[PDB]
Design an enzyme around this catalytic site. Structure first.
Site, mmCIF file in Angstrom:
data_model
loop_
_atom_site.group_PDB
_atom_site.id
_atom_site.type_symbol
_atom_site.label_atom_id
_atom_site.label_comp_id
_atom_site.label_asym_id
_atom_site.label_seq_id
_atom_site.Cartn_x
_atom_site.Cartn_y
_atom_site.Cartn_z
ATOM 1 N N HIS A 115 -2.694 6.507 4.515
ATOM 2 C CA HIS A 115 -1.278 6.651 4.628
ATOM 3 C C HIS A 115 -0.975 7.955 3.929
ATOM 4 O O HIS A 115 -1.332 8.153 2.682
ATOM 5 C CB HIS A 115 -0.613 5.555 3.802
ATOM 6 C CG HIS A 115 -0.540 4.208 4.493
ATOM 7 N ND1 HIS A 115 -1.078 3.957 5.743
ATOM 8 C CD2 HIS A 115 -0.011 3.018 4.075
ATOM 9 C CE1 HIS A 115 -0.940 2.662 6.059
ATOM 10 N NE2 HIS A 115 -0.217 2.083 5.104
ATOM 11 N N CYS B 197 0.771 -1.197 0.000
ATOM 12 C CA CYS B 197 0.000 0.000 0.000
ATOM 13 C C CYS B 197 0.796 1.236 0.000
ATOM 14 O O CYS B 197 0.410 2.205 -0.672
ATOM 15 C CB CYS B 197 -0.998 0.020 1.147
ATOM 16 S SG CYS B 197 -0.154 -0.514 2.815
HETATM 17 C C1 LIG Z 1 -4.038 -8.020 6.618
HETATM 18 C C2 LIG Z 1 -2.799 -8.171 7.565
HETATM 19 C C3 LIG Z 1 -2.451 -6.621 7.643
HETATM 20 C C4 LIG Z 1 -2.939 -9.001 8.863
HETATM 21 O O1 LIG Z 1 -4.155 -8.582 9.398
HETATM 22 P P1 LIG Z 1 -4.882 -9.503 10.412
HETATM 23 O O2 LIG Z 1 -6.239 -8.685 10.665
HETATM 24 O O3 LIG Z 1 -3.878 -9.336 11.472
HETATM 25 O O4 LIG Z 1 -4.727 -10.892 9.679
HETATM 26 P P2 LIG Z 1 -4.688 -12.209 10.412
HETATM 27 O O5 LIG Z 1 -3.404 -12.695 11.192
HETATM 28 O O6 LIG Z 1 -5.678 -11.796 11.506
HETATM 29 O O7 LIG Z 1 -5.239 -13.063 9.249
HETATM 30 C C5 LIG Z 1 -6.624 -13.393 9.622
HETATM 31 C C6 LIG Z 1 -7.173 -14.737 9.188
HETATM 32 O O8 LIG Z 1 -6.292 -15.310 8.219
HETATM 33 C C7 LIG Z 1 -5.930 -16.538 8.773
HETATM 34 N N1 LIG Z 1 -4.558 -16.954 8.479
HETATM 35 C C8 LIG Z 1 -3.365 -16.576 9.075
HETATM 36 N N2 LIG Z 1 -2.322 -17.336 8.615
HETATM 37 C C9 LIG Z 1 -2.864 -18.164 7.693
HETATM 38 C C10 LIG Z 1 -2.359 -19.250 6.799
HETATM 39 N N3 LIG Z 1 -1.025 -19.578 6.777
HETATM 40 N N4 LIG Z 1 -3.274 -19.942 6.004
HETATM 41 C C11 LIG Z 1 -4.538 -19.665 6.076
HETATM 42 N N5 LIG Z 1 -4.998 -18.666 6.847
HETATM 43 C C12 LIG Z 1 -4.238 -17.928 7.642
HETATM 44 C C13 LIG Z 1 -6.013 -16.356 10.325
HETATM 45 O O9 LIG Z 1 -6.201 -17.520 11.114
HETATM 46 C C14 LIG Z 1 -7.273 -15.554 10.466
HETATM 47 O O10 LIG Z 1 -8.307 -16.511 10.230
HETATM 48 P P3 LIG Z 1 -9.620 -16.940 11.029
HETATM 49 O O11 LIG Z 1 -10.795 -15.933 10.740
HETATM 50 O O12 LIG Z 1 -9.680 -18.443 10.899
HETATM 51 O O13 LIG Z 1 -9.293 -16.751 12.476
HETATM 52 C C15 LIG Z 1 -1.655 -9.224 7.320
HETATM 53 O O14 LIG Z 1 -2.202 -10.532 6.992
HETATM 54 C C16 LIG Z 1 -0.634 -8.776 6.310
HETATM 55 O O15 LIG Z 1 0.266 -7.998 6.660
HETATM 56 N N6 LIG Z 1 -0.788 -9.266 5.060
HETATM 57 C C17 LIG Z 1 0.086 -9.060 3.903
HETATM 58 C C18 LIG Z 1 -0.980 -8.326 3.019
HETATM 59 C C19 LIG Z 1 -1.212 -6.822 3.194
HETATM 60 O O16 LIG Z 1 -2.083 -6.456 2.425
HETATM 61 N N7 LIG Z 1 -0.517 -5.985 4.055
HETATM 62 C C20 LIG Z 1 -0.662 -4.526 4.299
HETATM 63 C C21 LIG Z 1 -2.110 -4.002 4.054
HETATM 64 S S1 LIG Z 1 -2.318 -2.175 3.992
#
Ligand SMILES: CC(C)(COP(=O)(O)OP(=O)(O)OC[C@H]1O[C@@H](n2cnc3c(N)ncnc32)[C@H](O)[C@@H]1OP(=O)(O)O)[C@@H](O)C(=O)NCCC(=O)NCCS
Ligand SMILES: CC(C)(COP(=O)(O)OP(=O)(O)OC[C@H]1O[C@@H](n2cnc3c(N)ncnc32)[C@H](O)[C@@H]1OP(=O)(O)O)[C@@H](O)C(=O)NCCC(=O)NCCS
Ligand SMILES: CC(C)(COP(=O)(O)OP(=O)(O)OC[C@H]1O[C@@H](n2cnc3c(N)ncnc32)[C@H](O)[C@@H]1OP(=O)(O)O)[C@@H](O)C(=O)NCCC(=O)NCCS
Ligand SMILES: CC(C)(COP(=O)(O)OP(=O)(O)OC[C@H]1O[C@@H](n2cnc3c(N)ncnc32)[C@H](O)[C@@H]1OP(=O)(O)O)[C@@H](O)C(=O)NCCC(=O)NCCS
Ligand SMILES: [Mg+2]
Ligand SMILES: [Mg+2]
Ligand SMILES: [Mg+2]
Ligand SMILES: [Mg+2]
Lengths: 354, 354, 354, 354
Positions: free
Chosen positions: C243, C148
């Protein structure tokens, strides 16, 4: 058959919620955007749109106009969320010119012939407009909605006091900043701090709640309202909308938290029975999770967003006392939403002509 | 004649207040900075100095060392503010090795032979160490300080319950984030929101307060503590230190807010009479302004900063009920300060040898 | 006819924007809510709905399901916002199974045969997908969209680089918390504080911007890209979404701010020309007031809210340097909205098929 | 022997730092607490002590007095942090009466015969005071210190400009709330938001930096100052003190970051050499971690806390460009601490006399 509304203080924090809601309303249109320090300017350029979504396209370009009763021949409803002290004279002018005035300002809230209206709670009191019209000798009228903070507690307490021997409520509030307007609260008052509002604000909260409660039509008859003890301790922190209130509620006789929870869950009044456009179908929502409601996630609840008081944490404290919290959206139900609802109620009771 | 202290979790949020206070203390020196995920590293480089002033120069360069009873021959006092569940086994090890252990952790708070100590309130209960030493067969001992949030209410309530027929207290707290540690509370939980902590946290607050209260030596004898009703509703917002608590306090007989205010103003115990170095001279300060105390301006009050509970807003609600608020510094009095004070109390009663 | 989308990570911060946007989409349905921690529970009771509005009534009761390709055969499109390290192999297996995968995770963003796609800027790189299928030996594919924070700069520098002799950009970011997920950023990092993210994070921003720039079709050819100088110093503070970036942009020759400003207000590409449902009309909106954009007020801008980069403050610094700020919505444009737009483009180009 | 100082605006944000610092000073006493809104009330009951520690016990009971030169004859030194517009003529009358006036207000900052002084950077400009007395026909004088935000940049660019062929700087500020006073910044400008300050404010920052730069004695003479290019884009967010600035610094030739870094760590001037009591040892402290400085943790840095600019993140951008960030305490260095240091210097140079 569409009714034309004038919104005083249209660009303020309550004004913009009249704007946002009415520009979707089925038959009450935001037609006339009154202001004062910016009259002559398009609304879209002065407004602080501190609320959800975007200024409506078809409002963005309307000129802000004078707050002058004699220029509003074309107008059917006046909504008036003007500052204390200025509001009372302007509202009176308006009523004297023949307008119906639905006011969110405190000035008129305790005139014995002005309703203080929570449409789900004391709908019969709009008949005070008849004694008002006669006493004041004017064609229009004034209605007021209560203090957002007082509605946050008066609603679940109204519902309760209606059906139980409730003899006290001891409340703490933690209110959001948009109630005080802009500039309103200095940032240095609430960054890393909590700002209590003092005795005059607590006393004004309890006094509005008592007049509401004294107008609830009850199903039991004890205790008298004279013997009911209220108290509030109020504060503001750095949240933008949403007032969170913790209530400990006391009773004369043993009373189960599970009973009260069912009366709250099922609470409804004439706004629900009549189906007014702005009436939530559950003006009180009950949540069951011991970390809810939370200001940020629950202030926009309900089928009409922001119109429901969300009440949570019901729990037995002793046989005669329970605890709950309630979260109201201070500028929708606490202010513009509430006033809309009031206006629909008066159109349906024939006080405002269609 | 200087006593050498080991601070477990030295780099944590409570650890740094042991560090900050002891590195000015007249005869208890921060001598041994124990940690675990950073052992071998200078303290100055790992510590999060989320408190007033600066890491002391003469501490900045000391190595973080292992939390290992057998390596601390040179140490006279152990202060242990370790996480729940890990804390209880480590504290026991330490006592078994012959150390006196002053612990800020919950694990031991309800062992019947471990004191739960608020030195101004239940100083006699350190004699439980004699039954503890015999029952557990160890040379050292364990003392615990209460939950910062429970001390915020237990102190003004202790003072009150000591001298009045107090039959209930109904409390709401709005606590700061540094109690939960680091990473502790996610920013998204408290930016523009209020985060309630739930039933297990409220129930644990009331249970600590009841054990404190049951150990207050009282001047009246009604009601029994069995018949006293407590309840708490707790929350965290985005303040850094300082827990703000609103209490409605109930009585069996008519009781004037002005009477209670004088007992609070004059409240003192053995820490004041003994002149311990860390004892504030007014462990309770009473403010008179209806917008105080405020977290940011009043959490560092008192001649020993952060050791006083600042109580405000005393006002009569009905003949039998009053309202007040109290603000404690959660990591000084609520935690490290309190434990220091406890350690001074035990040195002066001969439990820790000079 | 309807495309059925699986949303991986569906309860997360970026996931929820997939659910919210897809629930209104004319042809891409959120049919398959995938997860791992909370598999078998209703979405509505697990999700954190830290976004506009309420969970859609049709999504709330849907079970959270396994993230397992052999169970999704009725699914058309997979959208993957999984965390670094975990995303890479999961994306691969999905491709290998035959799915188109649109990813917001950093894992594949530098594979030579994988697009790194902003549909307005380097839309022809989608044709990497054909060498991709043949050298990976799969029928599905992977496409990623950029960090982003890289998009918030590259979209305006893309539009600038296409038309002007741009020789560097020197950027300061002030990023919101939702990009780090939950529990993501500790509240003590950013209350009364600003959190720099450090060198790794500044290096990775710049490195994505360069890849995207290298793929812009330009109307000039001075200077070479290898001679362009980019820098970022990034940070987070306590906003929820949005941002904010300040850019000092350099040129090889006298270049007029007023002309750049216009090239920014007139920016348009394939998504606009094709009228894709998620393409804002003005993927760059330019504001004129010297106090805008502001995160709170301009992050939901555009006829598809959250999809436009808003740019303000255009100004001549000296003849070869100008300054501007830009504001991107980090989980709509910056992640889920841009993946939806990418999927639209692939449908229109026939890479994804009914 | 003792100098007696009057502090104008003594209850304000900058005033309080005068009281706090002067209360520990070996020879400058805070003898005369001046005001206007609250004249005749005790300082301690009016002040907002939004700073470290507690109001000094000796200051609290002192009456707030008139801001009137004919009542201060026992006073030596006048310090004036008054608001724009009001400061100018009040400063003049004080000078005309015979007082040395050290001002933190912008009114006289561009008078040709009035110094604009950072004691570490242009200490010889104090000799403007002699033409000043003769052309103004007064025995007192005025000296001003620069906008805090201009100092946070000019101190590091001063040290750089003295030794290197520096041809521009391109700055982003993220300023705290205390610089705007109280009620100063509305809390709704900066909760979940960032507030840009606009063009006037960016123009005035730059213009002060240029005046100070024009007065640095340099060891080189390339490029000319008139050929230096400065820009600022400024903002406020919700921190209490401390102004964080990111600087991209340009040079006329290949210049090594490691060398600048060292010229910054070795920076020293007259206050250091004279050992003035308020001179920090290292008026620029340089930090090495890629996550520092952080406002919360580094704004009270230095052996005189708040008096050092802290600089971090030094890095080569390309051969002719480097990036750094700096953190200044805006009301200690940025205002009251620097006025105290200025007064020290004038005493040592004999401009102020017992
Ligand atoms: C979106 C992001 C910011 C994390 O946010 P989050 O709200 O903390 O995400 P989570 O750790 O909570 O991911 C949530 C779900 O994905 C699932 N998940 C996590 N690891 C996983 C894997 N290896 N395989 C499948 N699912 C997974 C989690 O269990 C949770 O699922 P649930 O509803 O069963 O409980 C993070 O995943 C990330 O940094 N992603 C890279 C993508 C991105 O777009 N980053 C910046 C965005 S501005
Ligand atoms: C609504 C309220 C919060 C003020 O909000 P605000 O956002 O600061 O509103 P403002 O005072 O800025 O102004 C709104 C407009 O009303 C106008 N207004 C102010 N005084 C006026 C008067 N005497 N006559 C007509 N208009 C007036 C302003 O000039 C401004 O108009 P503009 O658009 O011409 O420039 C405040 O009016 C209030 O406290 N009202 C009583 C209702 C209440 O209890 N509100 C809190 C609800 S949670
Ligand atoms: C004090 C408290 C708030 C945690 O704070 P924190 O700032 O997150 O402390 P941490 O868990 O980060 O760590 C402090 C140090 O203790 C160490 N520690 C953690 N577990 C440990 C264990 N089992 N044995 C020894 N040390 C341990 C950490 O590794 C860290 O050491 P390091 O400096 O070697 O890297 C938390 O421990 C707590 O909740 N404690 C019970 C006391 C209480 O009620 N506190 C709140 C008071 S208001
Ligand atoms: C310090 C500053 C930020 C304002 O802060 P403040 O806390 O809002 O200041 P005030 O408006 O409260 O000034 C406070 C006192 O000065 C008094 N004062 C204001 N105008 C005055 C005048 N014309 N003559 C005498 N006194 C005056 C006020 O009455 C108040 O006095 P009191 O204790 O009698 O009530 C503001 O004065 C300012 O911007 N000053 C220019 C100097 C500066 O250093 N700016 C940026 C600092 S980083
Ligand atoms: Mg206003
Ligand atoms: Mg920790
Ligand atoms: Mg997560
Ligand atoms: Mg002021």
């Amino acid at each position: 058959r569409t009714l034309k509304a004038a919104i005083l203080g249209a660009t303020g924090l309550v004004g913009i919620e009249y704007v946002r809601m009415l520009s979707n309303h089925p038959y009450i249109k935001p037609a006339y955007l009154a202001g004062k320090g910016s009259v002559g300017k398009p609304y879209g350029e002065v407004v602080r749109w501190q609320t959800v979504g975007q200024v409506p396209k078809e409002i963005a370009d309307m000129e802000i106009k004078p707050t002058d009763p004699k220029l509003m021949d074309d107008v059917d409803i006046i909504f008036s969320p003007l500052p204390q002290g200025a509001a009372g004279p302007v509202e009176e002018q308006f009523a004297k010119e023949g307008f119906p005035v639905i006011s969110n300002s405190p000035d008129h809230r305790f005139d014995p012939d002005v309703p203080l209206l929570v449409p789900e709670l004391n709908p019969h009191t709009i008949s005070l407009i008849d004694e008002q019209r006669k006493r004041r000798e004017w064609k229009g009228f004034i209605v007021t909605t209560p203090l957002c903070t007082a509605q946050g507690a008066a609603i679940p307490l109204g519902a309760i006091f209606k059906d139980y021997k409730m003899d006290g409520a001891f409340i703490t509030t933690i209110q959001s900043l948009s109630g005080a307007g802009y500039p309103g609260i200095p940032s240095l008052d609430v960054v890393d701090n909590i700002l209590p509002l003092g005795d005059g604000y607590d006393a004004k909260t309890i006094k509005e709640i008592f007049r509401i409660l004294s107008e609830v039509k009850r199903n039991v008859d004890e205790p008298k309202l004279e013997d009911v003890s209220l108290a509030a301790t109020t504060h503001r922190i750095a949240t933008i909308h949403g007032h969170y209130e913790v209530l400990y509620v006391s009773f004369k006789e043993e009373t189960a938290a599970e009973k009260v929870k069912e009366t709250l869950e099922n609470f409804r009044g004439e706004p629900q029975d009549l189906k007014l456009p702005t009436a939530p179908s559950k003006p009180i929502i009950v949540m069951n999770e011991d970390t809810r409601p939370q200001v940020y996630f629950d202030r926009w609840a309900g089928d009409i967003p922001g119109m429901s008081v969300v009440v949570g944490r019901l729990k037995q404290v002793n046989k005669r006392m329970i605890r709950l919290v309630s979260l109201i959206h201070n500028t929708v139900r606490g202010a513009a939403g509430g006033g809309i609802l009031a206006a629909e109620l008066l159109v349906e009771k024939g006080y405002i002509e269609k």
